[PDB]
Symmetry: C2
Subunit: 133 residues, 2 copies
């Protein structure tokens, strides 16, 4: 995969991706404005990068997000379409860095960077099960 390549991905925001839906178990978020949650915008940014990566993984491999650095600069109600642009900045071993950017058809809603690590799934899964209570 080539540094500089861009992938864009569109998502109509449903009613259930507001801050109250991220944590339905939180009383403290229960009365928040009905806007797209930062944690859901982050997942939508990961989703874009994972889709861009998928052609380049060997069977048995996947990836996990290892860092996120983004701003969230305008609020998005349900119904608008959020487009995420993921651009490859670098590949160093199993580490990929992305520039990630999102716009709701009205405003830029956020941007910054995201890093992912390529993992061997069977091995990672067996390791992480050994910390399971």
């Amino acid at each position: 995969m080539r540094v500089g390549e861009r992938f864009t991905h569109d998502f109509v925001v449903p009613p259930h991706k507001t801050v109250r839906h991220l944590y339905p178990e939180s009383p403290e978020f229960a009365e928040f404005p009905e806007v797209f949650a930062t944690g859901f915008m982050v997942g939508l940014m990961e989703w874009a990068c994972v889709r861009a990566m998928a052609p380049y993984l060997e069977p048995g491999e996947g990836s996990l997000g290892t860092a996120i650095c983004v701003t969230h600069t305008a609020a998005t109600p349900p119904g608008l379409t959020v487009t995420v642009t993921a651009e490859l900045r670098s590949v160093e071993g199993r580490r990929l860095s992305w520039r990630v950017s999102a716009h709701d058809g009205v405003d830029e809603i956020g941007s910054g960077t995201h890093e992912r690590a390529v993992i061997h799934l069977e091995k990672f899964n067996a390791k992480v099960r050994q910390k399971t209570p």
Copy 2:
């Protein structure tokens, strides 16, 4: 509200806070490992800060996350307790900046900064309506 003020928030990770649960609409996340998603980790760090700032907000005020910049350095299967620490690093009028970190009892899982803005809830909510389809 006081700079260097610290809040701890403990949360037992349930099975439904994996990558697959953040976006059940996504075929691409369907076979990810069953570990605590970044977007849910972001959410939990935001929840810690909203709890800490609550006793300082005036009636009719709330807040929104305006930036998240964190690493995610180890994985967490359901069942472990994630403890988030939120330490206020600056307040300048409406803008609060927190140093956030989380550990799952076994590993430090993540570290960085979270910014939030105090909003006038009626006035903000009116602004969301003028862009609601």
